[PDB]
Structures are given as C-alpha cells and as structure tokens.
Amino acid sequence: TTITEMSATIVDLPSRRPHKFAATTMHHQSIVLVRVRDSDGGEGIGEAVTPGGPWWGGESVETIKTIIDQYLAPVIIGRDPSTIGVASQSMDGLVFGNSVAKAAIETALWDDRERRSRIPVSDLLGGLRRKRIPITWAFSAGSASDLIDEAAQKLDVGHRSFKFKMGAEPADTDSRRVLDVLECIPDECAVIVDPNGRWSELEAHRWLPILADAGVTVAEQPIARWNTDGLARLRDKLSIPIMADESVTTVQQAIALADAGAVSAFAIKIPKSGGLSRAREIAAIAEASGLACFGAATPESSVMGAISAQLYGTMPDLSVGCELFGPGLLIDEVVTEPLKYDRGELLIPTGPGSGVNLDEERLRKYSRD
Amino acid sequence: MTTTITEMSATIVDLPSRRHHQSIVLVRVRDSDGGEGIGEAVTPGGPWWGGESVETIKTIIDQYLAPVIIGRDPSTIGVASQSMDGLVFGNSVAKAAIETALWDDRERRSRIPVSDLLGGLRRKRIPITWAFSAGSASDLIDEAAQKLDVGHRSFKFKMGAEPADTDSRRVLDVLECIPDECAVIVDPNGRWSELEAHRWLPILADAGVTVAEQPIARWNTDGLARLRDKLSIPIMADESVTTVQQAIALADAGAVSAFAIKIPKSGGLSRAREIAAIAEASGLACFGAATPESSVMGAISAQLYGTMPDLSVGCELFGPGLLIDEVVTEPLKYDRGELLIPTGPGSGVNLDEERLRKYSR
Amino acid sequence: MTTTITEMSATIVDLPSRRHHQSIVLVRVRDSDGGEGIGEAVTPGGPWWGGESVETIKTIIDQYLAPVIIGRDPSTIGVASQSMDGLVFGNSVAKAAIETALWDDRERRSRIPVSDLLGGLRRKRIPITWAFSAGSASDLIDEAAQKLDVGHRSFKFKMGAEPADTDSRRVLDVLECIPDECAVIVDPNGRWSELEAHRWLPILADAGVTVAEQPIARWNTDGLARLRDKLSIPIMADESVTTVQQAIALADAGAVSAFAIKIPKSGGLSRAREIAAIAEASGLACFGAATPESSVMGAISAQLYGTMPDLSVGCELFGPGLLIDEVVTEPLKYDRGELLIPTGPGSGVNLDEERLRKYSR
Amino acid sequence: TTITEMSATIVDLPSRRPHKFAATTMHHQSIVLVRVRDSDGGEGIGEAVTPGGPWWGGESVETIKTIIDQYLAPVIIGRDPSTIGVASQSMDGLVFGNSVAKAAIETALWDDRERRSRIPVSDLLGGLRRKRIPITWAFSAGSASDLIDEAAQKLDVGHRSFKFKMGAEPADTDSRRVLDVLECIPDECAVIVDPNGRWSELEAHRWLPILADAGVTVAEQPIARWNTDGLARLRDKLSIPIMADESVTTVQQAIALADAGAVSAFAIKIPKSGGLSRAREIAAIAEASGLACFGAATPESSVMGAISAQLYGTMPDLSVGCELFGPGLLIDEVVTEPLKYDRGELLIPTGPGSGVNLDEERLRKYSRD
Ligand SMILES: [Cl-]
Ligand SMILES: [Cl-]
Ligand SMILES: [Mn+2]
Ligand SMILES: [Mn+2]
Ligand SMILES: [Mn+2]
Ligand SMILES: [Mn+2]
C-alpha cells in the first residue's frame, strides 16, 4: 500500500468579518488544501494556513503550494502511508523550515491513518481527555466602539474568556483602546493581549502593568521572538504570566525557553510546529517543565481546526484555554460539516481521521483561479 | 457506553532462565467485546534497582490501580495514566505493565502493530548489544568469542558487584581479546564513588571502553556533569532518567551524553517515548535499553525502539534470548545477532495459555 | 518626488556549471532616470539549507516584497529593508537579492564601488579557499594537486552526505597528501550528532584539519560551546549565524571561535556587515563565506569582504570560477589562486543582455 | 587623489546661557574645528567637542589639537580620502583612546566624501528614515526658580520631552530641586534625569523611585561608568528604565552591557564613540539586543550636530528621543547655516556631506588666540 497522488490547491474562504493583525488586516481566509490518495482508494486531507500572509512566519499560500508540489512531494508519492515518522524526517532532510507546508502533509497523513483504521486521530494519540473545550474569543484590532458591542454580545452566547489582538498602532493609543473595552468586561474573565511581538521592551514594561491592573490576565508574545532575555525580565517584573507563541515553534525552542525560565506558557498550534507529532512534543515539554498550555489558533478553517481540536482534547493541560473560534467566523468551508460550537464551546470532532470530510463541490467552488 | 474494560488480572510468573528464574507480573485486560491486551511488569531482580518487586507490584495493580481501569473506555489510555498518577505516586513498573497492556489491546482491536500508532517503523531489524553478567574473567573471554562469532558487534560489561579496582581488572582482562573495533558500554549501576569513576574510567576507555552507563549515584547530577566533561567517552544516564522532568534537568545541566530508554522505569510507552523526544530536542543520544524483560515487554519495546528517531548508542534487548521458556505463543526472533521487530497486531505477541498456567506462581 | 523605482523584476536563471546547473534569481531595479541595479538570490541547491528556493523566492519578491519597493525613493535602502521585514518574516535570500540590487543602483548612480559606501577597501586581492565536493577519495587527491599548484593554500572539505565514520576516512585519505602547512576547514553542514563530532573531529584535527565549520545542528548552542572548549581547533558558525541576534547570542554563550559571513543568509549587505561588526566586538574571527553564488552576488560580496576589518579564517568565493557561463558582461577575475576585487561602479559588474535571455528559465 | 592638508583650530563660541554639569558650568562652547583638504580641492569639516573640559572623558580642546596635529595627522596626510576604514584603523594603531580627536577626523572624512559625491552622508548610510526629530530640552542645574520659567516657555514652543542635568550638589538637595520643577511639568511628558554617574548606589536607590513617582521617566547614567553590576541591580529594582551614556563608548562595552543585562538603553553620540561608523555599530548592537536608543548630545555646535542629526535620521530607533538642542543655544557658529528648529523639532540637514558648510570669516572671528 503506497501513496498514489497528492494535490495542493489554494482555497479562498469567505469570512464573516475582517481580521486586523499587526502587519495586515485579513479580508478572507486562504489555505492550501492538501490531499493524499492511497493505492486502495483512501484519502486524507490537510490544511496549510497562515495568519494572512508571510508577515508572521515567512510562509504564504502561494509558496506553500510550490514547496509541497515540487520539493516535498518526492518523499510522499510512492511511500508507505503508515510511515509518518520517516515521511517527516524525509521532509526535514529536503527542506529546512517550511513548517506550515510540512504540517499540511504530516496532518493529511494522520487523517488518512484515522480513516483507514476507521477511528479519530485522538485515539492514535491515547484518547480524548475532554469532549468539549471552552473557546477564547479574539477581538480584532478594530475600534473600541465596535468591540464593546461585540464583547457584550459574545458574553451573551457564553464566553468568559477573551483575547485582544494588538500591535497595529502605537503602544499608547493601542492600550487606551484596549482599556476602553475592558471597562465593559467583567472582572472575573480571562483576558490575553497579543501584540504579536511588535512591542519594545520599554513599551512592554510601560503598558503591560497598566493593562494587568485593568484586568488583562496573560500577555502573549509581547516582545520580539528572539528576545529570550527580555521575555525573562518581563516574566519577573509582571504580576501576570507571559505566553510564548512566535517564540515556540520547535521542540528545541521549547527547551531553551523552559530553562532560561523565560515564559509562563506555550501557545500550542499545529501549523507553526510543522505538524501533529511535534505539536504534542512541545506540549510534552510544557508538562515536563511545568508551563501551562493554550490551545492556540492560526487561525484555520475547519480542516486544520478539527485535527487541532482533537490534539487539544488529548492534551493534559489547556489551563490558559483554547482559541479555536476561527472556523466559527467562516461563512463557508471545504468540509461537509464544520466545527460545531455551543454556548461558547467547541465540541471535539469524533468521526474517523481528523473527523471532517471533504466537500468536493465546495473545494471546486472556492479554489482560487 | 461503548466498549469498556470488564476485567483486569495480574499474575506473578516465574520463567526459567540461564541466569535461575526471571519473575514478571503478567497483566491481562479484557474488553466487553472479548478482546484482550497483555503487558509485563519487570524488575532487574527485585527492589534493589527501583523499589519494586513482583509481589508488591501485583498488589499495587490489584488494589490501588484497578479501580481506575475497570469500567473505563479502553481508548482512553491518557486519562488512565493520568488517573493512575493521581492515586499512586511512583510505582512505574506496575504502571507500565497496565499502560502497555492497554496499547496492546488497542493495537489488537485496530488490527495494527502499536508501532503504527507511534507513526510507523523507521527500521525493521535492530543490532543487539550483548551484556555479560558480573561474571568471572575466563567465562567472558569464552562467551564473547561465542556471541561475537554469532554476529554481535556491540557489548556491555555489567559492573558493581565487585570492588571497583578488581572489578576493573576483570573487565580490562576480558577486553584484551575483543576487537578494538567493537563498541563497549560499562554499567557500574551507579555503585561507584565519584573518585573511583575518575580513576578507573579513563583506564577502561583507553582499553577500548566506549560508553559509561550510570557510573555514579542517580541523584549526582553535578558529578555526572563533572565526568561528561573530564572523560574522553560519553556518559549515559539510566537510573537517572526515569521521568520526563529528569530527562529535562539532565539536558539542562549538561549532565550526560545519552539516555537509556526503557519502558518499565519510565512508566509506560508514551512516557519512555516522551523521554526520547527530549533526547532529540537536546541532541543527546538514545540507547534501546533493557530491564531486562521477557517477550511481552520485549515486543512492545522493540516496536517502540523501532519507531524512534535515534538509537545510535545501540540496543540491548537480548533478554528474551536468555529464557528457556516463555508465556507467549511466539518469542522474539533473533538473526545473526540482530533483533527482528515484531510485526503483528498490538505488541505483536500473544499468550500461550498452557504455559501461562505452567509458570504461574 | 525625486527619483523613484518605477520597475522591479525577478527572473529565474539556470546557469551551466561543472557541478549540472546553478539556479539564481536575478533581480533588476529601475530608476525613473533609466538607471538600473542588479542583485542575485541564491541557494546552495534549493530549500535543504535555509527553506528557500528560486521558485518560491521569485514569488515572495514579485508579490509580497515589491509593493514596498515600487514607488519609493531608491536612496532609502534602510526604510526598504525595514518595510520588508514588516511584511515578510524570514526569506533572507529573497530580501538580500533586492537589498543588494538597491546598493548596486546607488553605487552606479553615485559612480562609485559599493565598497566606498562601506568606507572603502582595506584590501585589493583576497586568497581563495578551495572547497571540494562531497566527492570520492581519489578525485580529491587529483583536484588538490591541481588547485594546489595553481596557487590556493587554503581548503575546505564539504561533508555530510556520507555516514560520519566513512566520511572521515575519505577526508583523512585526501589529507595524507596535502602539505601539513595548509589550512583545512571541515563543514558537515550541521549533519553530525554531538557524539560523532566528539569522536571524529579530534582525529581530523591531528591529521591537520584547521577549522570545524558548523559540525552539529544550528540550534545546538550548548553543544557548539562544549565543542569550542573540548577541541584543539576553532569552531565556526555558519547555519547558526544568520542574524545579528544570533551573532550576539553566540558571542555571549562563548559558542564559536569564528563566524562565516555570507550576504544571502544574512538578508543583505548592511546585515552581513553588522554581523561581522559583532565578530570584531567580541574578538571572534570572520570567514568570507559562500552560498555559493555567481558573479552578481559574488562581486558585491567580494567588495563587502574587501571592506571588512577581519577576514583571517579566509575566503571561499571560488563559486563563480565553477561556472561555464554567466549573465554578466565580465565575471570575477582570479589570479594564481587569489580573487581580484571588483572595482567599478556599484557591485562592479553589469548585465550581458544576450546571456540573461539565453539562460532565463 | 590624496589628502593634502589637515588643520585643527580651537574655536570658542558665544553661548546663550551658561550650562552647569556635574564638574563644571559651561560659559561658552569650545571646539576644535578639523579641516581636510584633498588633492583636487575638496574640503571636509569635523568637530571635536567636549562637555566643558576633560572632566567627562579625559579629552580637552587643547590636547585634542595636539593629538590631531602631532600623532594622528601622519596617517591622514597623503592618504586616499575614500579609505575611511583604514584611516580609522591606522589612528587606533597609533593612539589608544582619544575618541573625540578620532571622531573629528573620521567625521571630516565622511563630510569630504558626501561632498565629493554631492550627497548627504545619510545616503552613504542607507538613507534617512525620518526628516524631523523631536528635541528633548535639557535644563541646566540652575535653580528651580529659573527652570520653572524656562519649562513653561519651552513647553510653549512645543517640546513634550525634557532632561534635568544633575550631580552638581548633593543628591538630596538636587532631587528636591528637580521635584520642584516637575510640579509645573505635565504628567504626559518624558523626563530623563542625568547625574553624570556621580551618584552612589545608595543615593541612586533612595532618590530615583521618589523621582519616578513624580514623573521622571528615564534615568541616565546614575552611578559610575564602570559599575555594571550596580546598573543591573538598579535596572531590576526600578519602575523606570536606565540609560547608559558614559558606560557606552565602545562597541565592546555595548556588548558587555547588553548581555550583563545592565541597562535599558544607549545614549548614542558620535564624539564619544570616536566617529560615525562606530556610533552606528553601537546602535546596531542596541537593535540586536533589543535596547532602545537616544539621540544624545555632547553637546556640540552645528558642525557635529549636523552629522549627528543625519546619523540619528538613518537609525532604526530613537524611542528614548533626541537631545540635539545644543546648537539652538549658540548665538553664533562656524557654519553658513546652523541647524534649523521648528516648534520644538530639528529638521535634518539634507545638503551634501554633513550638510553644513564652513563660514571662513566666522571661523577666523571665533578662533582662539
Ligand atoms: Cl496569533
Ligand atoms: Cl551628557
Ligand atoms: Mn499569537
Ligand atoms: Mn543500567
Ligand atoms: Mn557551511
Ligand atoms: Mn549624559
């Protein structure tokens, strides 16, 4: 039994509202959908996804396709579908980095596995430890006006956990904006703030404590990804914990941080770690070193969101919470059944493989020209 | 509910060996679908190494660990491990026995080798490193030329029972006729003092020793670090890596060159693997170590070692080969000094019911 | 406005070599005054080294980087680099290609070598260090006595494709007839494990190896530090120094003896220089390294290496010499095994339009 | 093409008010004006300047001239004007230290370059990143009476950033004085305090927090230059950042501080670093290590002020601000066009070279007898 075909198709997905990060605003969602067909007719799907282009991690849907088609494909076509380990090491041997590219393949491979065996990947991992996850709602960098009307409404549906996306505008304007919205958020809530590593060490130390005073509960990647020391000084001064996101993309980084004592938590995410196995390993290192985990978002459609949801359900710790709200914000998808939410909670897919299936009409419909 | 565990048993089993018995505790888990999974608790030879024994293991399992296993969904191995940790501190070998049994049950329900749940094999055979007893000079110049000509190119002299000085003179004597080209591990079992390790270990390195397995006490991180640096050979932790937090501490402290991976001390498949993952992330090497064990633990282990990225220190799963009989229908096959990785569903071995009854204590 | 960039193009170009093609992406920037600057994106041979390829580079440039280049004042190279960082994480080789092209355009508008903007040359020629392929023993005893008699007194054996053990036996064989007086770098490409580096690297040092370029993985600072100290030879980072923050970390951690300076991995002229400045401030040595590249990147590089305070590890800009043809009117001149630093405006080379069309993919 | 002459002339410049530092009060300004004439008739100018004598850095206008005339000249006369790199290394090879001396030559050399090429030095550097810089107004150590009338007026013209010069009198009197003036300064402002490294570790820890409570925003060199540890302990205790000035004069010091984690920022200044290249390198190290920069003053006339202004405009970071107010305080100069201010901002010279030209009548007029 061998892998027979693998296609990588760029898909654009209509999105319910624009999503402004530090270096772009996202007007729709863009993924590469990977497909792996095997010798006796079984199929797996993976997704490559990015927070609106190469600003975050240097990968783009356009270049992802190419790396997959041209440089990765050769170690996947004709291979034994069950040898995901060797396929991952093969890919590393031909291409440095390009983790979002590797993630979509490694992940499609696991989906294939789950479906050949007729079980959810979460089994292959040792089984779910929870069936539902509470979702952390992430506000866009929009105005404080819009967000007070959005907060009040999401508190409604049931969320008690929030994230403010930051870094699109100077520290000082940005923090006033956020302090504004925090006025109409109950004291009891979790609030992460995520400047996407765009703040200076000076700005971080100026504004974080002011925001912690106003109820901000966690600081996600406040300063640059390589500034381990600065992160460590912050972790000491601050009354609130610091989470690595951009700073943890590999198991080696996990270790370096853990023991430089540079952060309080990991944001765990498949694409950025180059797949399901590596993502768990990073979380295993959090466990081994007593750091918390967050079920983080890229964001992604229901394809990657589903395998992620299963991951996060196998994980021993998501004390920081989970932000898998992304799919909820898409108006359409390439799956037959997108992720189901309820009263502000994700229900973990249980179907075989990743737990979601292609809809080939939608795929065709939303393929990019 | 879906399928549940209706039954678990733990049976002490004394198997005949060439050294005069290896005691194990065989765990047996049953589905509400009549499916069964098996796992093995083993100890080097009782509580001297960790603080565990077949007699005490049986109890821990029967009385303290079973209440979180009976009733549950088998697919929930993680919650089972977590629930065990919560009721029982330590007792890794007991834990590993249940945990592996569960992985066995899954492999056999899904119809695949457990190596597939670990993302497949990266290799099909593994060269075996042969370990001599703490025996007497002559016998080892015999036993080497035997196991040597039959294929094995990698070796370990078990040390610790003699006084370090004469104990060296013995190991040094055996060595004088082992090809300088071979790989040699020494394993004092952490019984050497820091001073004996510094005086005797360079001398053996010169005589061709390749790797010092746990020369000094398990808690002595600084000493281990002092040695990793003062020697021309790598240091390998064994007694010192039993948990994922220890693996991390050692990496950090630059204490050792390599980790010995074994499933029993680690408390199960997932944990031993996690430990190996740490070795990879810090660029330390792995050894596919042995408790030792029969083929129950041996099989699942060989599958684990098979899926592992790194196994460059070698692999010493020779243990089953020393047994005169077994409680599986089909013991681990070896070939010109290589182990042949079990390929069938679960761990890839199954009970011989007659023999299980014959060797039960 | 004053002068603006009206146009930028990126063309994939496959040039014939003696190993069967070096792919580059040639960048071309145009003034609103009809002035042009050129720059080269290069990869060792695709995404294996960094994660970059000519196909993906072209895209990054055409679609993601150009929106901050078209329109702007050419003199504003700094704001251009900063604006690129902001839109694209990583992708240094793409970035370097635009950045150098911009420096080219400036040099050629001002009528001076870019070396003048860097505060002038400190030297006119540079001895070239010759790098052998990961080839087979015999060929390298041939190719040495050739490149040796033609002048070269400094060498690098590319390693990593073979298993460390035989790979050494090969490099050790070639060495036995290279004058003990020569300089020898080894570059496993970070493919060696910590253990293989510790066992094999002393042996080559004895056989006359002079410098270990990136023996172990790029992230393994501690291992690099452990080696810098346990060896009798210097360690040189390459894969490990791609940014100014990495250079600083390594200095700090006492991890390496020297840095390999290359413009592509560094993301441009200013950054590679900044990295070299760090080497000076910490008293680590520089090597004038190679991607390798054709004469586009080669020229500007040779000018950079020319302005640098320290180049004592040597310089390995032999790359263009291996090309059968080129896309400049006038390739880098060599002489009795020394490179002759380009002297004309900008990078000191210019397009051959016929050839650019002939070798375009 | 070769350097033909180089003269070094001591100039005294009438100054609008006296400037009291820790170890003198400055009654006028004193510079050595360096001139480099080349074979085909091109000229560059540099300035050597000092904060009122050798108290700060051990250099004086009188000894600067001598080092230039006697020991530096020999590697500059007859040299290729474009080989600034080798000229700098040559100078280091003959004279240890004497950075203000080296700066005036290295800098004159760059001015020459810019003018031969007919462009602003800022081009040679990679181009301006801003055309204007807001200026930080530095009060003298005068009485708190005078300063309340000066603060109120400078706030007027447009400044929102201030520095209090300190160290002329005991810590306790000094800080009360400063607290006085801070009463009539708006909360929103930046305030640096600069004791010129004259405070003890005890005094620093006593008074800094009291001053931070009253609105002081940065502490410049509070303790001795060599007390890296003490600086590091301060950086930890304090709610406000610490800036190295006297402690950063070389690229090696930059590195040592950065990674002893001893300060929050660098004060960048050409004279003290021995020139334009070295000054950028120090700033490059700030970038590489995530420390902020300040466009610092010596102060200097418009000659050095102009090349500095260009430097600071090329720099990626001046988050601490810029204090190039010095020239504004001179009543006359040796240039034809001094630095232009507007509504409390410096406009960066754009003309070729350093961007300012000699006025040979003024030079003659203000040469010292
Ligand atoms: Cl994010
Ligand atoms: Cl000052
Ligand atoms: Mn984030
Ligand atoms: Mn042992
Ligand atoms: Mn290299
Ligand atoms: Mn100062």
Coordinates of N, CA, C and O and ligand atoms in Angstrom, one line a residue, chain B residues 48-49 156 158 185-190 213-214 236-239 260 262 265 287 289-291 316, ligand 4:
Chain B
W48 N 16.1 -3.9 44.4 CA 17.4 -3.3 44.6 C 17.5 -2.0 43.6 O 18.2 -1.1 44.0
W49 N 16.9 -2.0 42.5 CA 17.2 -1.1 41.4 C 16.3 0.2 41.5 O 16.7 1.3 41.7
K156 N 28.2 -4.9 26.4 CA 28.1 -4.2 27.7 C 28.6 -5.1 28.9 O 28.0 -6.2 29.0
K158 N 28.3 -5.6 32.6 CA 27.6 -5.3 33.8 C 28.6 -5.2 35.0 O 29.3 -6.2 35.3
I185 N 30.1 -0.7 26.4 CA 29.4 0.0 27.4 C 29.8 -0.6 28.8 O 29.8 -1.8 28.9
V186 N 30.1 0.2 29.8 CA 30.2 -0.3 31.2 C 29.1 0.3 32.1 O 28.7 1.5 31.9
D187 N 28.6 -0.5 33.0 CA 27.4 -0.1 33.8 C 27.6 -0.6 35.2 O 27.1 -1.6 35.6
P188 N 28.3 0.2 36.0 CA 28.5 0.0 37.4 C 27.2 0.1 38.2 O 27.3 -0.1 39.4
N189 N 26.1 0.4 37.6 CA 24.8 0.6 38.2 C 24.8 1.7 39.3 O 24.1 1.6 40.2
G190 N 25.6 2.8 39.0 CA 25.7 3.9 39.9 C 26.3 3.5 41.2 O 26.2 4.3 42.2
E213 N 27.7 3.9 31.2 CA 26.3 3.9 31.7 C 26.4 4.1 33.2 O 27.1 3.4 33.9
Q214 N 25.6 5.1 33.6 CA 25.4 5.4 35.0 C 26.5 5.0 36.0 O 26.3 4.0 36.7
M236 N 26.2 7.9 29.9 CA 24.8 7.6 29.6 C 24.0 7.4 30.9 O 24.3 6.6 31.7
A237 N 23.0 8.3 31.1 CA 22.1 8.1 32.2 C 21.2 6.9 32.0 O 20.9 6.6 30.9
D238 N 20.9 6.2 33.1 CA 19.9 5.1 33.1 C 19.0 5.3 34.4 O 17.8 5.8 34.3
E239 N 19.6 5.0 35.5 CA 18.9 5.2 36.8 C 18.5 6.7 37.0 O 17.5 7.0 37.7
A260 N 19.5 6.1 28.4 CA 19.0 4.7 28.2 C 17.5 4.7 28.3 O 16.9 4.9 29.3
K262 N 14.0 2.8 28.5 CA 13.4 1.5 28.9 C 11.9 1.9 29.2 O 11.7 2.9 29.9
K265 N 10.8 1.5 33.8 CA 11.2 2.6 34.6 C 10.5 3.9 34.3 O 10.2 4.7 35.1
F287 N 19.7 4.9 23.7 CA 20.1 3.5 23.8 C 18.8 2.8 24.0 O 18.0 3.3 24.8
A289 N 17.4 0.3 25.8 CA 17.9 -0.4 27.0 C 16.9 -1.5 27.4 O 15.8 -1.7 26.8
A290 N 17.4 -2.3 28.4 CA 16.6 -3.4 28.9 C 16.6 -3.5 30.4 O 17.6 -3.1 31.1
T291 N 15.4 -3.9 30.9 CA 15.2 -4.0 32.4 C 16.0 -5.1 33.1 O 16.5 -4.8 34.1
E316 N 20.0 -3.3 23.5 CA 20.5 -4.4 24.3 C 19.3 -5.3 24.7 O 19.3 -6.0 25.7
Ligands
MN4 MN 22.0 0.4 33.8

